Write a protein that binds this DNA or RNA. Structure first.
Lengths: 61, 192, 170, 106, 124, 148
RNA sequence: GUACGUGAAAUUGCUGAAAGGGAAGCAUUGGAAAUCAGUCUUACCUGGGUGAGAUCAGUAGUCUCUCGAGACUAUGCA
RNA sequence: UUGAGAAGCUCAGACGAGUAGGCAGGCGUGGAGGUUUGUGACGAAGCCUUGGGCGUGAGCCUGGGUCGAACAGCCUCUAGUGCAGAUCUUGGUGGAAGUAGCUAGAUCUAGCGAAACCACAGCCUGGGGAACGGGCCAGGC
């Protein structure tokens, strides 16, 4: 995991992660203290899938 | 005129007034301050100057008492330079011998309209997430159909159906490491 | 962007001029004093010089390991132990900027350490150690001349049962 | 052995009260070892704290502290008045307190 | 400039917690033999003008701004000169089509919005 | 429909429901309280025993007017009765839930009564109190060794 | 789902948490637990380089008002 | 110096219980004229909420959930306009109660089953002047 900092964009993360040896990039979208979307891209130029998460439930629940 | 107009509009009814708790505001497009006052009323002030923005360019608008009954020609307009120092001097030259309060309020509006244009340009360059609306009907439809889909999925039945299926096919080595000896013996006798 | 857009009520001209702090009578340079708070609480240290508000204090490195540090004068108990010769060590280099925290800077570009978090680390320069190595050189003979001073500064002050701070004298 | 104890032990007695009215804003603190109002003048302005523990841990620490400052003496027997950043709970009557030696004027 | 509130608890109607038929909204006790009206010891407090807050900081949110209800983009443009005194508050009945355009407009105007993230999601 | 309990998903639950049942609400509340949480097979024996007066249903909440009995010592109290009409309704519902579980392909040797709730149906000076009864039966949840 | 739009309160059942020596009970002040608002550096100033273009041209036209004021067009970007 | 809603802004001092009663300014509801080039199927109104905020208060704004077709701010006009009481009216619903009891089987069990009443409560001892004990004060439990 890498905390998203400042004004780095998904395309910039993808180009930076490709040179670091990463294969797939997963970005969790949260707003109002709730995760509601998930976009996964396949480095370096693979297809990017955008999902919407729902019924999130951690192990304790 | 002006004192009669102000009594009618400032105290009986103006369609431009927004009555707030701490202050009254003006819906007029020609108000420099945006407040309902006697000095900032464009209707009650026969000589009035304001700055407003048109497609990225700020203009100085002025009206005189002598054009008050010709609405199409009431307000005159000049271009204010992008150079801030020249823009301030343009207001000073065009508003020469006007009251110092009116020039003061026009220069204050020029600063706020210049900052807003600056902030508008910087927002364009930045990458900001697009706000997408939440549709109450689609949320209700997808929440109900999801509940039906989860029930129809039969996850535990299908998970164990596949897990046993791949146990039969021997996707593991010779004997799997996840199975007790007695269960593995039952698998061998049944599958053969 | 420069003509004031708002009312911008300027503050009225205040009449609070800055006058030098008056330190206590007993907080003289060369006094063995007990640190009251911080990570070195209880440690006995030697006052080198008085800053504008604080005391530029240090315990000998080889005695108690308290580097040249600033301490607030309210957070120090000045014991009546015999004074130490400090006129032999220059203290002009100990200014406000000398102890000032290094400016948090570094034009880190996007990604790498910005995102990948390959951050750098801090380390005390040998310049600080070089000045420090001088002060114990000019102070250790002074503390060795009088008895128990080396053992005094090594120990850490503490309160035992039945000790009344208001009564017993420091 | 011998701990650190750079403070003075003290006890929380009660609030600044009349017979039937209480004022939890000010607490009466007994700095043990101080026996008169003149002796209490040494401890005026010192920082007093109430150290307690909670089962839930925050930042890996189960110890919570409420800070205060001794304001003035109370009575002829060396009890003092202390005002804390949060008013001390009524259940901490008779509970221990720590009176620091800072700010110092000695 | 710090906002000082003389009181934060609301003034509840007397005996409003004993009956469901009696609402919490404050009603002046008209009973002559009522202990609350005569203000005994232990009786609840009553709304007095002494509790009134500072005129300068009246109607001010804890962040120092005064709420301004906004129904469209035209309302938010009025705060061009008063963005350091007022915060835009989009009305509850304004749809999500207009809430997004108010928030984008209020961003360029330098105006704080009290409920800017309502009825919308994000897409970075 | 939807039941009062967050279970009754398809996973392991079989539901049985009875609405506007012509039985006293207070009696049914006691019978439901007794068999709640107990295994399905054991519940059938208990309902069989009550019909033959071999076992008594302890009345805890609506204990008014219930005489002392020697068959309630299993549940720790002494106020118990032998309701028949209320027990008959619960027998019919339990069989329905058992048949629903069998049709679902559920493991029938681990079924327990996870949730049973009795609600007051509309009242119909002799306005009696009909009952709504809902029963959920699910397998006893079990653990598995982690890695060793 | 015809016990049918919305579906309040009184009232009832179940579940969860907490409390509980012959009342509840509310107020004031805090603790504990749970749960929220609640926010951030990101901009300003000063450059230099590079090109960019107008409200800049030792520039040419059109239109609407009234010389010059707005809107454009072509060209140059010194 | 911009601080002329002159119905504004500003400076200073004193003062603050209150029944009957007198006076002033405000909050809210249904409908009407005007207005907001107003809000709304990208969700109006309503309701729910230990979400947040504003007002001394009446009240108002808002997030989330539910919901499904209308609705509101401002100036003015208007009135069948604001409830805790009336042994109030209508409707719903409780404790009393599975009680009092009334249909079967063997007083017990089964089945069917009310109504009066109901501010809330429920140990004493004294004193508490107006009863004060059931609430209050000092003692036991």
């Amino acid at each position: 995991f890498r905390k998203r900092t400042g004004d780095i964009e998904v395309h910039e993360i993808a180009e930076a992660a490709a040179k670091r040896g990463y294969t797939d990039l997963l970005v969790l979208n949260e707003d109002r203290k709730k995760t509601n979307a998930l976009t996964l891209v396949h480095l370096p130029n693979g297809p990017s899938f955008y999902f919407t998460l729902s019924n999130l439930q951690t192990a304790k629940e | 005129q002006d004192e009669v107009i102000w009594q009618v509009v400032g105290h009986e009814f103006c369609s431009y007034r927004i009555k707030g708790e701490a202050q009254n505001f003006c819906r007029n497009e020609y108000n420099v301050t945006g407040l309902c006052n006697r000095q900032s009323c464009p209707l009650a002030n026969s000589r009035y100057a304001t700055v407003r923005e048109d497609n990225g360019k700020l203009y100085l608008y002025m009206k005189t008492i002598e054009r008050a009954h010709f609405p199409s020609k009431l307000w005159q307009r000049i271009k204010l330079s992008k150079n801030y120092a020249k823009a301030l001097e343009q207001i000073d030259q065009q508003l020469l011998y006007w009251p110092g309060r009116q020039i003061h309020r026009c220069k204050q509006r020029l600063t706020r309209l210049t900052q807003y244009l600056l902030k508008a340009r910087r927002l364009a360059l930045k990458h900001q997430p697009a706000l997408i609306p939440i549709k109450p009907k689609q949320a209700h439809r997808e929440a109900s159909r999801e509940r039906k889909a989860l029930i129809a999925a039969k996850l535990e039945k299908n998970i164990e159906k596949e897990l046993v299926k791949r146990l039969k096919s021997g996707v593991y080595g010779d004997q799997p490491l996840n199975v007790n000896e007695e269960i593995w013996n039952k698998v061998l006798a049944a599958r053969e | 962007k420069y003509y004031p857009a708002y009312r911008e009520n300027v503050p009225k001209k205040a009449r609070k001029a800055v006058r030098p702090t008056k330190l206590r009578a007993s907080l003289a340079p060369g006094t063995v004093c007990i640190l009251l708070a911080g990570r070195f609480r209880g440690k006995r240290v030697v006052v080198l010089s008085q800053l504008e508000d604080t005391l530029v204090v240090t315990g000998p490195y080889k005695v108690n390991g308290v580097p040249i540090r600033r301490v607030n004068h309210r957070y120090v108990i000045a014991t009546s132990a015999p004074k130490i010769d400090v006129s032999g060590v220059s203290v002009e280099k100990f200014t406000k900027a000398y102890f000032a925290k290094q400016k948090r800077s570094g034009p880190v570009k996007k990604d790498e350490a910005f995102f990948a978090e390959n951050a750098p680390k801090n380390a005390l320069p040998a310049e600080r150690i070089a000045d420090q190595k001088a002060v114990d050189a000019k102070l250790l003979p002074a503390i060795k001349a009088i008895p128990n001073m080396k053992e005094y500064l090594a120990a850490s002050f503490a309160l035992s049962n039945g000790d009344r701070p208001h009564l017993m004298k420091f | 052995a011998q701990g650190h104890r750079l403070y003075v032990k003290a006890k929380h007695l009660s609030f600044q009260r009349s017979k039937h009215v209480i004022h939890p804003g000010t607490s009466i603190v007994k700095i043990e070892g101080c026996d008169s109002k003149e002796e209490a003048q040494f401890y005026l302005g010192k920082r007093v704290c109430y150290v307690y523990k909670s089962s839930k841990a925050v930042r890996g620490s189960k110890i919570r502290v409420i800070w205060g400052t001794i304001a003035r003496p109370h009575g002829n027997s060396g009890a003092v008045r202390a005002r804390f950043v949060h008013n001390l709970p009524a259940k901490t009557f008779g509970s221990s307190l720590r009176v620091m030696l800072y700010p110092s004027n000695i | 400039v710090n906002i000082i509130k003389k009181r934060t608890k609301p003034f509840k109607r007397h005996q409003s917690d004993r009956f469901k038929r009696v609402g919490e909204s404050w009603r002046k006790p008209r009973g002559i033999d009522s202990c609350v009206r005569r203000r005994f010891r232990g009786t609840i407090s009553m709304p007095k003008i002494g509790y009134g807050n500072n005129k300068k900081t009246r109607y001010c949110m804890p962040n120092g701004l005064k709420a301004f209800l906004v129904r469209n983009v035209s309302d938010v443009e009025l705060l061009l000169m008063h963005n350091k005194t007022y915060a835009a508050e989009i009305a509850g009945n304004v749809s999500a089509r207009k809430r997004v355009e108010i928030v984008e407009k209020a961003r360029a105007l330098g105006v704080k919005v009290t409920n800017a993230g309502a009825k919308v999601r994000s897409q970075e | 429909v939807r039941y009062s309990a967050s279970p009754a998903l398809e996973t392991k639950c079989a539901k049985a429901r009875g609405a506007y049942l012509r039985t006293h609400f207070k009696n049914s509340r006691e019978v439901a309280f007794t068999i709640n949480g107990m295994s399905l097979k054991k519940a059938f024996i208990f309902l069989d025993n009550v019909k033959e007066h071999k076992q008594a249903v302890p009345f805890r909440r609506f204990n008014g007017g219930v005489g002392r009995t020697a068959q309630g010592k299993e549940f720790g109290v002494t106020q118990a009765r032998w309701p028949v009409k209320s027990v008959k309704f619960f027998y019919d519902l339990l069989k329905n839930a058992e048949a629903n579980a069998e049709a679902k392909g559920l493991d029938m040797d681990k079924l327990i009564i996870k949730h049973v709730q009795v609600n007051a149906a509309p009242k119909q000076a002799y306005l009696s109190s009909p009952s709504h009864i809902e029963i959920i039966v699910a397998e006893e949840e079990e653990a598995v060794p982690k890695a060793n």
